[PDB]
Amino acid sequence: SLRTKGNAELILQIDAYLPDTYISDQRHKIEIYKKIRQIDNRVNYEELQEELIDRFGEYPDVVAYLLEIGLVKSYLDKVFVQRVERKDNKITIQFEKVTQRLFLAQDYFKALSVTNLKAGIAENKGLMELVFDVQNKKDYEILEGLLIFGESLLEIKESKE
């Protein structure tokens, strides 16, 4: 309580940023970068796209990803993910000890069960970790899985009051 959301650490090795080719002016970048770290939910995100196209035209994939990751993150944050780290075709999510209040094993399984990534749950130091095999997987597919997984899990959370 008093804490609305967590703050997940994302090590995804997707290349995402604002290229000089899209935004030249320094203070813009800065602003938009902050703006991006400001994404709390979908509508933000959506408006942020509306904004960028609005005043910078179509954006390249690295920008798309910067955005996606932002959105994605907002979710992993609300379900109190502590770290997502991709390491040798193995993305492995770990949560805060608090999640043990919010979630049960099948809560996670449900959420994975519904993404296209193939996953498993493992016990590391008494806690639960999700590990996705991400071989052959394009960034957008990983973003999609994470995305879906996250929003999938938020609904469970909301689902208790």
UniProtKB/TrEMBL annotation:
Could you tell me the superkingdom of the organism this chain comes from? Answer: Bacteria
Where is it located?
Answer: Cytoplasm
Q: Which family does it belong to?
A: In the C-terminal section; belongs to the helicase family. RecG subfamily. In the N-terminal section; belongs to the UvrB family.
Give the protein's function: Couples transcription and DNA repair by recognizing RNA polymerase (RNAP) stalled at DNA lesions. Mediates ATP-dependent release of RNAP and its truncated transcript from the DNA, and recruitment of nucleotide excision repair machinery to the damaged site.
Q: What is this protein called?
A: Transcription-repair-coupling factor
